[PDB]
């Protein structure tokens, strides 16, 4: 019984098939994740990744930011998350411009049109996820605290 094998049945490729790299659980998770999901539009891939990332960005800026002790902590945290989203979406845009030569096909992220659709989805998702985090934290007192509301 050997749990580590050469990657893709190619010994000289620079990878090793391992339980962490090539278990069915790892393969299922990667395929399930939006970036590698089959049947998913590049814009939709960006929306799902963006909603996730924008949602969790608000919390560190809100809880640990300069204006954390102020009553405007959530607004500052959302604005800081939003500013980070705008900087990152600029990074996505410039990477797309330089990396990919313009081609007609848009069905893949690794295309100029596909990365532009991905960046579009990521911005919409990230602003929406950040907004969703803002709405939820504002409405729920427990989220406003660090979990010490029960205490």
């Amino acid at each position: 019984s050997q749990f580590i094998k050469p990657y893709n049945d190619d010994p000289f490729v620079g990878n090793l098939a391992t339980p962490v790299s090539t278990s069915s659980f790892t393969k299922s998770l990667l395929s399930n994740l939006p970036a590698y999901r089959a049947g998913l539009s590049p814009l939709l891939r960006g929306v799902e990744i963006g909603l996730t990332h924008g949602y969790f960005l608000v919390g560190p800026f809100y809880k640990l930011g300069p204006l954390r002790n102020s009553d405007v902590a959530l607004l500052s945290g959302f604005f800081s998350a939003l500013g980070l989203i705008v900087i990152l979406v600029a990074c996505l845009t410039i990477y797309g411009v330089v990396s990919f030569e313009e081609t007609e096909a848009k069905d893949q992220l690794q295309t100029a049109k596909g990365w532009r659709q991905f960046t579009s989805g990521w911005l919409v998702g990230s602003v929406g996820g950040a907004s969703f985090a803002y709405i939820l934290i504002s409405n729920i007192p427990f989220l406003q605290t660090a979990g010490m509301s029960m205490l």
Binding site: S1, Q2, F3, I4, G14, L16, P19, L64, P66, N69
Partner: protein, 742 residues
């Protein structure tokens, strides 16, 4: 009887002929120098025995006799420490008043005004204050006389003569054959049972019969010359039974297994002796007796000549699972045919043990009156941290030498080494990521705190008064060790160390040991430690794993362990050898150990060491400034280096002026190293060309053509001066600081 003694008789002739021909040991160097590089190449490769000879037998013989020469040097060194204690010390004065007299076993001659170094250490004595802790060792041994120190000096001298004789005898008269050295089972049986086990058993016996009665009489208050001589405890069993009434029954309780009779002198007290601030010697006697039994029992594990025992080859070849291929197959063949593989393991272990020694010896002070002799505590911690770090980097040095030279892929197919080399990119990339993560999240917290404190934002810092990074796991383990007596160590009376919590132990109104509370500053400096250890591992591991080949240089093993580069091509392959990762990792070891000894020095002065005032208040040496100032780099600069360097800078005209001189001299040597580190050989060779011209002009050119040092030697000289300069700076700073204030 396949384990047998086999020796070649009269192998090598004892002649001075090869002494008179420097370089005799290698074919390259034996034809004589033509350039000055030969001179350096002589010393650089002398102990590299497996670079001179092909045969493992002659290599092993040279190593065995060189180990006897080293033991002869250690015994001569010990004999000198005992003689300087007997003749040039205030040991007898220190025995009467251990808390006021300062240990001193070195007296200087009056020559150029240097007799100012004979400072007033106390006891009607002038000499250099010594911090090696020998006085506390000798009091723990029960010496109580300078005559007995002369007898120990003679015993060391006799042992030094016997080891230098044994090295000569075992190289030149009766040198063992290779099949003698390749008895790892026999050697382990004897070094566990005989060396460590009878070493502990004999030392426990000495402690029970000499250290325990003499130190009970010393702590009762009896003056050293009123104490009976150590053999009078051996004969007068009645007199020994006065101090320990269990001696009235003799060895019947031992053999009848009635061991609870021996609880008078074999205790499990824990904690410290209130009189001396050291470990209870009854605990130390029981400790060494228990270690002796397990070490002797352990040395019966391996099979030698009678069918009982383990074959280590069988143990290793049976340990293989589904992740690890053939497993530990082939490792026994490695470790009985490669000396470097053994030295890599044993140096990493000896360094780890020396590091363990420094932590355990400060926390649980093992000698009487060593805890309140703060120069000794700081000195032996700092010393064993440096010996530990150096030996750990030499473990990686000889792991690199093994990989370059003794590694054979044919005998190492699909075993643990093959699999590590076959995923070394994953190992080094994950180690690289953890070092970046941990430099950001330990030192960047310091940069955050520097920035916030500089910006006036004290509420935005990582501190105990602000955002609290508490070490909850370390505090919890401290809680467990304070609750352990009577709960999870029920027969213990006190804690293993008062560092975990509990009482303040004071001796002569100075704190012997007291709880070391951990806060945000301790969290930050421990993650600094985890970061610096991780990066030193990354450089040393990256050198071991990439010693034979890379994607950069596919044939690095053909260039050797120690080569400077493979040219300016491929972008530049400067410092591509395994040697150059030992070279780069000794700097990061220096960085790691320097922060460890700085953390120890500041934390012990700030939160442990000091004077016990009335009502049990402890006024510490630097007054508890660690908690709010070791969180910023400016605090380390200001409240640790600047504040405590006062003693070295202001030492001139006193007995500590030698430390001020070594402080400046080592700053000089450290800076002088950077000439060798930042420069390259080609500059110095062209400069030497102009100097050679000036010699040629006066017809005074040497016949051994001067060369700039090799690229590797320029690196080695830079590193050696850097380590000497940095460590000597810290040595002078630590010693003048703690001799003045502690």
């Amino acid at each position: 009887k396949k384990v047998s003694i086999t020796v070649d008789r009269d192998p090598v002739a004892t002649s001075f002929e090869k002494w008179a021909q420097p370089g005799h040991f290698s074919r390259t160097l034996a034809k004589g120098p033509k350039t000055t590089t030969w001179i350096w190449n002589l010393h650089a490769d002398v102990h590299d025995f497996d670079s001179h000879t092909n045969s493992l037998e002659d290599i092993s013989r040279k190593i065995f006799s060189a180990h006897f020469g080293q033991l002869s040097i250690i015994f001569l060194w010990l004999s000198g420490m005992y003689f300087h204690g007997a003749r040039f010390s205030n040991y007898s004065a220190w025995l009467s008043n251990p808390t006021a007299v300062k240990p001193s076993a070195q007296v200087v001659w009056p020559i150029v005004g240097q007799e100012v170094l004979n400072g007033d250490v106390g006891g009607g004595f002038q000499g250099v204050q010594v911090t090696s802790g020998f006085f506390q060792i000798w009091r723990s041994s029960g010496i109580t006389s300078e005559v007995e120190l002369y007898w120990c000096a003679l015993a060391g001298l006799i042992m030094s003569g016997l080891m230098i004789f044994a090295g000569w005898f075992h190289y030149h008269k009766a040198a063992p054959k290779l099949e003698w050295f390749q008895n790892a089972e026999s050697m382990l049986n004897h070094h566990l049972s005989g060396l460590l086990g009878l070493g502990c058993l004999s030392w426990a016996g000495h402690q029970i019969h000499v250290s325990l009665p003499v130190n009970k009489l010393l702590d009762a208050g009896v003056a050293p010359q009123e104490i009976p001589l150590p053999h009078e405890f051996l004969v007068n069993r009645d007199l020994m039974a006065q101090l320990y009434p269990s001696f009235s029954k003799g060895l019947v309780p031992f053999f009848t297994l009635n061991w609870s009779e021996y609880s008078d002198f074999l205790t499990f007290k824990g904690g410290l002796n209130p009189v001396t601030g050291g470990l209870w010697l009854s605990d130390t006697a029981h400790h060494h007796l228990a270690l002796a039994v397990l070490f002797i029992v352990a040395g019966h594990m391996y099979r030698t000549n009678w069918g009982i025992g383990h074959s280590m080859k069988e143990i290793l070849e049976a340990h293989k699972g589904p992740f690890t291929g053939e497993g530990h197959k082939g490792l026994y063949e490695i470790l009985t045919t490669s000396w470097h593989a053994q030295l890599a393991i044993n140096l990493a272990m000896l360094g780890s043990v020396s590091i363990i020694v420094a932590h355990h010896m400060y926390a649980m002070p093992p000698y009487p009156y060593i805890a309140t002799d703060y120069p000794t505590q700081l000195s032996i911690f700092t010393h064993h941290m440096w010996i530990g770090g150096f030996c750990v980097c030499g473990g990686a040095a000889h792991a690199g030498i093994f990989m370059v030279r003794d590694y054979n892929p044919a005998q190492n197919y699909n075993n643990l080494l093959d699999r590590v080399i076959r995923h070394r990119d994953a190992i080094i990339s994950h180690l690289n990521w953890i070092c970046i993560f941990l430099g950001f999240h330990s030192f960047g917290l310091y940069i955050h705190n520097d920035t916030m404190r500089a910006l006036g934002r004290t509420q935005d810092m990582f501190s105990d008064t602000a955002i609290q990074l508490k070490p909850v796991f370390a505090q919890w383990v401290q809680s467990i060790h304070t609750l352990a007596p009577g709960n999870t160590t029920p027969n213990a009376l006190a804690t293993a160390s008062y560092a975990f919590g509990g009482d303040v132990v004071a001796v002569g109104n100075k704190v012997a040991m007291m709880p070391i509370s951990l806060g945000t500053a301790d969290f930050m400096v421990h993650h600094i430690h985890a970061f610096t250890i991780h990066v030193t591992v990354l450089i040393l591991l990256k050198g071991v794993l990439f010693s034979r080949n890379s994607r950069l240089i596919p044939d690095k093993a053909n260039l050797g362990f120690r080569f400077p580069c493979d040219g300016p091509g491929r972008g530049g392959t400067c410092q591509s050898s395994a040697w150059d990762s030992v070279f780069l990792g000794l700097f990061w070891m220096y960085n790691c150990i320097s922060v460890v000894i700085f953390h120890f020095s500041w934390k012990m002065q700030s939160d442990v060491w000091g004077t016990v005032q009335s009502d049990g208040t402890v006024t510490h040496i630097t007054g508890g400034n660690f908690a709010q100032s070791a969180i910023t780099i400016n605090g380390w600069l200001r409240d640790f280096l600047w504040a405590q360097a006062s003693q070295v800078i202001q030492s001139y005209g006193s007995a500590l002026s030698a430390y001020g001189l070594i402080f400046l001299g080592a700053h000089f040597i450290w800076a002088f190293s950077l000439m060798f580190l930042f420069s390259g050989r080609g500059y110095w060779q062209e400069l030497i060309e102009s100097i050679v011209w000036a010699h040629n002009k006066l017809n005074v050119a040497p016949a051994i053509q001067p060369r700039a040092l090799s690229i590797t030697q320029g690196r080695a000289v830079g590193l050696a001066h850097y380590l000497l300069g940095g460590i000597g700076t810290t040595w002078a700073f630590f010693l003048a600081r703690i001799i003045s204030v502690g």
